[PDB]
Design a protein around this ligand. Structure first.
Ligand code: MG
Ligand code: MG
Ligand code: MG
Ligand code: MG
Ligand code: MG
Ligand code: MG
Ligand code: MG
Lengths: 293, 134, 159, 170
RNA sequence: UAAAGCGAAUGAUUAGAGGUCUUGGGGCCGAAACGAUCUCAACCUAUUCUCAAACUUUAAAUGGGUAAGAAGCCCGGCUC
RNA sequence: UGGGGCGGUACACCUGUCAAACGGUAACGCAGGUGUCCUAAGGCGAGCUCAGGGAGGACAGAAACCUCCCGUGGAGCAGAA
RNA sequence: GUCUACGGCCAUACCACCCUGAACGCGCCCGAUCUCGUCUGAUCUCGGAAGCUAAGCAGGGUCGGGCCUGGUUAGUACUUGGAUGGGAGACCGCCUGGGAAUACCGGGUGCUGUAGGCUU
């Protein structure tokens, strides 16, 4: 036999980690580097544009760090695009670009910077960045909080970056992780970036398979088929989506129905009951042992 | 040992010395250097003692009380100082008094376990208590 | 003769407590220090960069300068008979706001409140602190039963 | 009514050929797997020197290869067929895996190469189930619970159910 | 630091209990054999006697600092 | 310089204790180290997680290679701690 | 009632094992055409949404271990200052003030900030 590791001593000496290190979600090292201000700033906020891509969504938030717990100035989600006529592809690069456009215009709408700071309207895909205006209220700036994503070539965060930047935010960035950087040659095809942004990558995959074999097409693209989505319609769909967003991005909340009020969960068991169980078990055991003998 | 062997026979007691000597004592030897750099080599061990600390203990029956006494009184002459010979209230080498002991063992609070004895509390899981009474 | 090394006799001072090793909670960094704010010092082993010298450990002073990540701070060190106010550059992690001054400032604010009121009335409210007085006379109702008689127990030798 | 989410599958097969030497023996035994699988195996080297057996620290000794899926099922089928569908008890581990080792691959059926030579090799089957990569994904790790673990007994009865494969003591 | 602690870490250290092989030395009916057989060995689990200037979770008394208002509080407004 | 001499270097340096709970403190007192090494064993970023033990598998054996499980650091970070 | 994203304090929140989870989410889930990376599309990257809560997660459970908090231990040990106090010495008692720690016996098992969901 061998020594049991997990004794009392072990648990006494055992340090606990933070809640968000146990759940595996938050990296505190990077949080530290990202978030504090220089002391000579004195209470001047350091904004950060968080981006959290889920299984079936892409959330983009803005946050600044107070001691009580990081305050959100404004927040968007993907599932509002059915209102603006986008039924599917909510975790594609295009819907990332869309979400960045919302975040930008909703924020600028609150701060009263609507006629000023339009940005890139024509989606060429080359480099655009917001020059500050002389004699006017300066540009918004915030630093990117990728979080845990491996900052690899072709990521929906940097898609959302290109979108939100064109919406007009002063985020510093290179174009190196945008799709286009040939690893050998090191040049950037922005038009190919356009292609991914407009969604030809999906159309071309669905044609290649429809040509190849119809059955995979039917297994893969069910809701696409149901909703009568086609290669030709997709581009103008996303383009109208841009125009609708630019015009009226703001969110109106839903009316709360009076709640039914029922407890699905089981409440915690009181003292007297806990005291009773072992009494019944011992008495019942003694009389049952009489049954055995 | 010698006295108890002569008196109460080969199997009527258990002596237990309770003082392990850890302190090391030094010695300063003089072999012409003199007194300079004089820090000693090890001569040997010895055990430090506070007031009220037990040196020896002898367990046997209460019948052979005075003979135990006479052994310890003869043993005083090897040690220095002064020491008192006190008969213990404890049942053997335990921390539990003799009057309430048999009641406690009958109701199975304490359980013999060779020379030692295990105190059962109520804090464990109950299926152990079931195994005990079964 | 002993050595004049910087970390002499700091086997236990800087060692972090039990089950409190590891990462530094971010409040430390994300809290602010103004000029003239009274600040007390507490060394910390994790960050070796910018540790104050052990002598200044415990000492509390006021902040004369600020940089990106640090504060110069004035302390009164005693040397052989004269004291020297002297200034040390400390990175923030080794620092706390000493809360001694806040209760006094609460009392000034309380007096200006208590003076604005009870001004028109003309009642003369005691502003000053008045030291712990001799307790006044009072009645002890022995309702019924009598005092329990304590007796010194007789000696008995356990050992 | 048991759930479809416990269809007991194979995660991976782990081949290795520890010849214990560098150079010509090795490059040829690596090329044998090259002939079998059509894919480049990985050379592992030693932690430290042992002069009795004649190996030094950091010496490229062995070669190994991971395999997953149908290609693995096929090669497993041939291997067991050579082992005539019967194993021992001691072959099964407590974590629910198992393995075995043919003394030489030529036994499998593949022609001998004079230049390459003959080589024994060593199979090892890591079974799994749906819902094991939680512990190995980054974003939110987590232990997989008690029921979902694969027992030694349940792997034995599963092999016994599948191929009517007998298990013998040892 | 004194103390206290080792049924809590580290480091020494005495004593008997229960285990099966996690292995082994002497036998004895056994050729041997994890059959058994007496054993006695180390390991594992609950206990028990004793310790620490260069071990410590705990942890005092005495002490060392800082503050106890005009150099302060509260209003109105310029400059960068 | 516990007479000088012969012997040590306590003649400049560093860690722990002696130190009497801020800091500061002595003896040819104690236990010990130094007169170097580095093209990276320095600098950024990413990705990996160690010591030890258990059960399995041709040659393979107490000890060679692969695999699962436990693993608050019991390893390691050139060197004294 | 309860959840998601981002959090502060960092075990009353950990570990082990058993039971139950309406709705949307969270998850698992099916593929490799393009971007990307592999011994291996398992991990990482990307395109889907037929199936399922089995696991994860949540809540509850355990005369559970632990951790946190109380009483007891104890006005004991120890200690600031005093005396033509004792005692052959070791050491000890008194006045004046400060005052602990295990075993043992009880009790507890996350608090909460912003924005946005479900019960339309
Ligand atoms: Mg002591
Ligand atoms: Mg001289
Ligand atoms: Mg000191
Ligand atoms: Mg001192
Ligand atoms: Mg796959
Ligand atoms: Mg589930
Ligand atoms: Mg408990």
């Amino acid at each position: 036999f061998v020594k049991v590791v997990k004794n009392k001593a072990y648990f006494k000496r055992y340090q606990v980690k933070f809640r968000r290190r146990r759940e595996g979600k938050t990296d505190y090292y990077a949080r530290k580097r990202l978030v504090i201000q220089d002391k000579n700033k004195y209470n001047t906020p350091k904004y950060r544009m968080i981006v959290r891509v889920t299984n079936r969504d892409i959330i983009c938030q803005i946050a600044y760090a107070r001691i009580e717990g990081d305050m959100i100035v404004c927040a968007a989600y993907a599932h509002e695009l059915p209102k603006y006529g986008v039924k599917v592809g909510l975790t594609n690069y295009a819907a990332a670009y869309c979400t960045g456009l919302l975040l930008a215009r909703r924020l600028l709408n609150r701060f009263g910077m609507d006629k000023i700071y339009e940005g890139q309207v024509e989606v060429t895909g080359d480099e655009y960045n917001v020059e500050s205006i002389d004699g006017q209220p300066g540009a918004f700036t915030c630093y990117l909080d990728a979080g845990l994503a491996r900052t690899t070539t072709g990521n929906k965060v940097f898609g959302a970056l290109k979108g939100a930047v064109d919406g007009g935010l002063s985020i510093p960035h290179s174009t190196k992780r945008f799709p286009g950087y040939d690893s050998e040659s090191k040049e950037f095809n922005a038009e190919v970036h356009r292609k991914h942004i407009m969604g030809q990558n999906v159309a071309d995959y669905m044609r290649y398979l429809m040509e190849e074999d119809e059955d995979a097409y039917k297994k893969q693209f069910s809701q696409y088929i149901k909703n009568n989505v086609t290669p030709d319609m997709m581009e103008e769909m996303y383009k109208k989506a841009h125009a609708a967003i630019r015009e009226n991005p703001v969110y109106e909340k839903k009316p709360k129905r009076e709640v039914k009020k029922k407890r699905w969960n089981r409440p915690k068991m009181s003292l007297a009951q806990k005291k009773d169980r072992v009494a019944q078990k011992k008495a019942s055991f003694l009389r049952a042992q009489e049954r055995a003998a | 040992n010698k006295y108890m062997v002569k008196s109460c026979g080969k199997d009527g007691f258990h002596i237990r010395v309770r003082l392990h000597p850890f302190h090391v004592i030094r010695i300063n030897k003089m072999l012409q250097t003199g007194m300079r750099g004089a820090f000693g080599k090890p001569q040997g061990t010895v055990a430090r003692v506070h007031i009220g600390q037990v040196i020896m203990s002898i367990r046997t029956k209460l019948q052979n009380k005075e003979h135990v006494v006479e052994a310890l009184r003869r043993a005083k002459f090897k040690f220095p100082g002064r020491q008192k010979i006190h008969i213990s209230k404890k049942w053997g080498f335990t921390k539990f008094n003799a009057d309430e002991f048999e009641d406690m063992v009958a109701e199975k609070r304490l359980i013999p376990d060779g020379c030692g004895v295990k105190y059962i509390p109520n804090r464990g899981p109950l299926d152990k208590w079931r195994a005990l009474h079964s | 003769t002993n050595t004049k090394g910087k970390r002499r006799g700091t086997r236990y001072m800087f060692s972090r407590p039990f089950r409190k090793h590891g990462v530094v909670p971010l409040a430390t960094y994300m809290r602010i220090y103004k000029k003239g704010d009274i600040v007390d010092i507490k060394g910390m082993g994790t960050v070796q960069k910018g540790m104050p010298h052990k002598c200044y450990h415990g000492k509390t002073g006021r902040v004369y300068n600020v940089t990106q990540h640090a504060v110069g701070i004035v302390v009164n060190k005693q040397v052989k008979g004269k004291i020297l106010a002297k200034r040390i550059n400390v990175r923030i992690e080794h620092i706390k706001h000493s809360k001694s001054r806040d209760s006094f400032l609460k009392r000034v604010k309380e007096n200006d409140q208590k003076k604005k009121e009870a001004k028109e009335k003309g009642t003369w409210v005691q502003l000053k602190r008045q030291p712990a007085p001799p307790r006044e006379a009072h009645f002890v109702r022995t309702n019924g039963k009598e005092p329990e008689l304590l007796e010194p127990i007789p000696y008995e030798f356990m050992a | 009514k048991e759930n479809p989410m416990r269809e007991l599958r194979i995660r991976k097969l782990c081949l290795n050929i520890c010849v214990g030497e560098s150079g010509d023996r090795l490059t040829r035994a690596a090329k044998v797997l090259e002939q079998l699988t059509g894919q480049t195996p990985v050379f592992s080297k030693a932690r430290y020197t042992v002069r009795s057996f004649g190996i030094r620290r950091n010496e490229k000794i062995a070669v190994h290869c991971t395999v997953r899926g149908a290609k693995a099922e096929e090669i497993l089928e041939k291997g067991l067929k050579v082992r005539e569908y019967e194993l021992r008890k001691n072959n099964f581990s407590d974590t629910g895996n198992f393995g075995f080792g043919i003394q030489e691959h030529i036994d499998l059926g593949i022609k001998y190469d004079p230049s390459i030579g003959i080589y024994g090799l060593d199979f090892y089957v890591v079974l799994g189930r749906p819902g094991f990569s939680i512990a190995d994904k980054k974003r939110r790790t987590g232990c997989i619970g008690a029921k979902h673990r694969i027992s030694k007994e349940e792997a034995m009865r599963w092999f016994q159910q599948k191929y009517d494969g007998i298990i013998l003591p040892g």
